[PDB]
Chain length 328, copies 4
């Protein structure tokens, strides 16, 4: 019975804000609804396929990537609440014109789960919001803040149903989109991740390339030393989907470094940080295996980072393995 | 520009049918649309959670399972085209009253992907249609036909978009649901699976319980003897989603036997057979590792069977491993 | 619980049809849903405004007129059930190519209520279906049959809700469109108009031009000789809306001849005949004031005719006035 | 490209408001969307019919009336921006609990056009917002302010498309609901009514009861003294629909007093005032024929008032007739 629109406004009136943060969130909600509608009928609109370009990270751009990116950018520019935007689909940070400038910096992944688009598997949108720290003219440097500085982070999941998960200092909340009235409804308040799960999520196709710690951990999940039942495996292939399941079911999600991705594949600014923030606000952990994801100070808007996140006891067990091998 | 309604009718007029098959298909389409709408807003309608009962196979029944099951059953009974119905949610076969009896037997899985319902991961509906073979009164025995006898089989996938995949003697076709007008639109005609893929799909959590063949194959996917790049791994956890990806991307999907499921987990009548039929009509293969899934003559409407399906070259490679170990 | 798709098919299986009539009806339903979706968001799609052309009758063509006309024509041509099409938006009858020819002739008004489009008042689509009578090549002459020869007639009403009213030899039935699942649901079966109503519908702006009979009748509705309460007046301005209200509430609808429209304004083939058929099948009457609308043999596909329709007692009272003045 | 959500917020940030007005408007938008969705499928949900009660004005309450009333009331109470609510469906004013109290007073007509519900003709929702004037505890007296004191007024029209018309000191704006994304989009900015129209809207069924002025005016519309073409007549029967057409097409709408309704039928607080405000902000006029509607100080929350509104030249002509007869 509580809509996201009311939630965000009521939360804004309590925080006594000028109103641009609230409007920033309202804009994202609108963009998310537009993206969801397009996604639920993409094939019919001939939105499946490549766009004909390659982004900095090296991924092949898809048509839905372009549409989603365009929607987010346009809605954020007219929110009059942003000054710098960093997108997975743009080589450089986008500087909003003075006229439409706000004090918020937004890092986003317009469409996450590229490889799953054509097979209709869950995909989504990820975002992280920062407050401008510098006093000088807005630049790409303003998006180079550690995740711990986020004011808000979350993601839209276009799965069997569309969910918008929003995390802020107060905690994590889940809102489901009701397609009939175009409103996100609060369905899970102050979400807390289970202390320990029974599912591990990772692409084992890179087994020959995993470091000794990941290798040992996976072996432990399949052949438990305490003779307990093995963990079940799940790997949707879309970070947003695997992470959301990790949040509501508990367990662990991993994307460590490998031969082709020496520093991990996932991007720090718009993939790792937003999810690390959601995880920590839900009582979970997010580490590269050597340091907290949210403490990393980025030097490249598109830098990558290995990431392990989920239930605290599971992530801690893996961390202990990394520590053990480091003292070896 | 071609709707499923037109497709099915035009296909029926060419086959010169009395019209009950066409109506049977029309009924399924309506049920699928109703299920999709409910699925896209399940959380809001409080449809997440257990129903309070356990089916024959031993699974814990969910609320969406009940809703979907009720929809399919009711729509099939009023289609005046069925005489015997076998559902994953019903202990025994359902015998349609004489008044509403038709000559078709339908085996279905109202909602596949139970464990993925609550985390919003893709789920779906699977069905297989047989023509009554006996001459005596319709009974559970009429659903105990080998998959090779299917007249039609397919599934609805409630993923980022809703897709209805239908297979018949003429081939496999994919129709996407356009939520705005409530019509499934043909988006992929006469689908053919790739001869060889680059993705393997299986729950490796059961590694300690896999037979030597599966174990050897997975090792080969991670450490290719020809030194080629390893296969990527994907396991959504919902048979319908993993199978659909296998169909459009190619590769292999596996659910072999393990300690808890000595004869595999997936059910022959409404999970394995429908997908095996779709796969073979698309030029793919479906085997237990020892025999063709579609050739198995069932003796229990709820019997399980191990299943390996997908691209012919991939499935064949695994089969060769099974043959090698059998002659060992 | 009964969908139009099931209704039409079940009705087709009982009539033992080749299937093209059923498919013809299925095609119209699809076109109606597409038109309804466009109508509910026309302003946003910039569909309000003129197209830049004038039809034979002299009306200024609108953009929605073009869209609706295009949808109906395209869906009817691919139904493989029509041979001649007459549209209010086309100067001449449309002859379907031999390849896609069927034996049905369809006269339709793609979008009725032109003057009400921009103010968001109810509009709709009207249609009448005939069976080809001639043996020679299909031509415009095949649409020149009296309304009494109709096999099916009806209209889609895009009002507060979208309704599809279908009339055939068996009677009149009303189906409401459920936007969520894109299915028309039977809500009013075997509709019968009240014997006498309490509402008269006519544009009194043409008062100076009305014939003595209409003038006397209206005076009687405002100043009842039996001292009963006067009839209420209602004139939406869209024939489909005024006629539908007349059907479900009873009463009378009138569009007599006037100075600018000596033979009435409404068109016989796709406005008057379809509604006259619906009215008579519902137990109502439809007259020009001098003869039954359905008995008129047209000589022009776009000829006009005065029309009075609705509850039998009300229409009869007006007819008696016409008879009285004719014997004067 | 401009959503109502953005419009209202951007308008609120410019007016430097605490945020409850913005939230009040956001709440109404949500209620309007919920009502629209229900309306577009009312028949299917069995929402047509009487509720079993009669309101103070004497109207027979319908089911949709109850649903709409419940939605508006509940959404307004949780907006934390209202203190007194006056509904056409409630005998007395509703006093919001201290906990959820705001400083705004809202008078509304949850569902206008009762007699048109069952025939699917356009219906809507009307509202007027006042700022609490008193300093003492909120009571019914706080809603007894003249229309000139309104801070905001408007209506939702559930016609061929759903439109939300909002009027405030800055002017009148029209937003169309896009059912796909559940957002109202600005389609008509700073609307201004034509100085003179060519349509008169009134129920002429009450002709025997009209005062001499109305009678003379109508005669003038049918038999123009300047020999110009007569005005066309339109009377949908739902105030919201007739008024909206008057706004966008120009012309005049009239509901004068008659035998059964000596002081007019329409209610001052939630029918006449909101529309009079919209009209005047659009450059139109609204009079009882003897005084400006917005200047009337109400003494009963459900009092009625005769109303004449629309294009200034048309309303003025009628006013001159009233003046002429008063000096007679
Ligand atoms: N809707 C909201 N929900 C939560 N926190 C908010 C909201 N609006 C403002 N805030 C907080 O107040 C600060 C200032 O808001 P603003 O003046 O809109 O930039 C933000 O950076 C947030 O920390
Ligand atoms: N719509 C259809 N699409 C494909 N095959 C059909 C269709 N309708 C009928 N058939 C074929 O014709 C047979 C007889 O149809 P029926 O008389 O409806 O039971 C079916 O068992 C199918 O093999
Ligand atoms: N779905 C249907 N509903 C009602 N009457 C039908 C239907 N299908 C066929 N008919 C009747 O049967 C005749 C022949 O149908 P067809 O062979 O499809 O042209 C039609 O002209 C109708 O009179
Ligand atoms: N969203 C808005 N649009 C227009 N005027 C507004 C808005 N919000 C506030 N106002 C104006 O500012 C006043 C105070 O707003 P509030 O503090 O929210 O009660 C209102 O009574 C309006 O006159
Ligand atoms: O195919 P891989 O290497 O497992 O990559 C999967 C990852 O790729 C991404 O699409 C990013 O490119 C993530 O959403 C997902 O976690
Ligand atoms: O958790 P597991 O053992 O991998 O089971 C997954 C399988 O379970 C099912 O939900 C059937 O119960 C399938 O849809 C899916 O393939
Ligand atoms: O404005 P008038 O002359 O009353 O015409 C109204 C008629 O015009 C039409 O739009 C046909 O042109 C009908 O739908 C409607 O009954
Ligand atoms: O049937 P009548 O007397 O013309 O009343 C119509 C009026 O009734 C109302 O429904 C109010 O009861 C208005 O919406 C409309 O203007
Ligand atoms: Zn990418
Ligand atoms: Zn991504
Ligand atoms: Zn991306
Ligand atoms: Zn199950
Ligand atoms: Zn299943
Ligand atoms: Zn199931
Ligand atoms: Zn026209
Ligand atoms: Zn027309
Ligand atoms: Zn027309
Ligand atoms: Zn009322
Ligand atoms: Zn009203
Ligand atoms: Zn009302």
């Amino acid at each position: 019975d509580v809509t996201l629109t009311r939630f965000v406004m009521e939360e804004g009136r309590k925080a006594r804000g000028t109103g641009e943060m609230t409007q920033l969130l309202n804009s994202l909600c609108t963009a998310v609804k537009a993206i969801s509608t397009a996604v639920r009928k993409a094939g019919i609109a001939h939105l499946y396929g490549i766009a004909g370009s390659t982004n900095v990270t090296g991924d092949q751009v898809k048509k839905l990537d372009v549409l989603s990116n365009d929607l987010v950018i346009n809605v954020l520019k007219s929110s009059f609440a942003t000054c710098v935007l960093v997108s997975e689909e743009d080589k450089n940070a986008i500087i909003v014109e003075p006229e439409k400038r706000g004090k918020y910096v937004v890092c986003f992944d317009p469409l996450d789960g590229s490889s799953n688009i054509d097979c209709l598997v869950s995909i989504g949108t990820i975002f992280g919001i920062y407050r401008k720290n510098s006093t000088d003219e807005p630049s790409e440097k303003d998006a180079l803040q550690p995740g711990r500085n986020l004011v808000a982070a979350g993601y839209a999941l276009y799965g069997s149903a569309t969910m918008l998960v929003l995390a802020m200092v107060n905690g994590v909340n889940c809102f489901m989109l009701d397609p009939a009235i175009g409103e996100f409804i609060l369905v899970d308040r102050d979400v807390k991740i289970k202390k320990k799960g029974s599912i591990y999520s990772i692409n084992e196709g890179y087994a020959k390339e995993f470091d000794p710690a990941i290798t040992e951990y996976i072996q432990r999940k399949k052949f438990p030393p305490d003779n307990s039942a093995p963990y079940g495996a799940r790997y949707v292939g879309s970070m947003v989907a695997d992470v959301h399941r990790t949040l509501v079911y508990g367990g662990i999600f991993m994307y460590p470094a490998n031969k082709k991705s020496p520093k991990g594949k996932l991007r720090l600014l718009y993939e790792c940080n937003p999810m690390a923030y959601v995880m920590e606000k839900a009582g979970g952990l997010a580490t590269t295996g050597k340091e907290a994801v949210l403490d990393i100070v980025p030097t490249d808007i598109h830098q990558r980072a290995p990431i392990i996140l989920g239930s605290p006891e599971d992530v801690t067990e893996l961390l202990e393995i990394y520590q053990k091998h480091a003292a070896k």
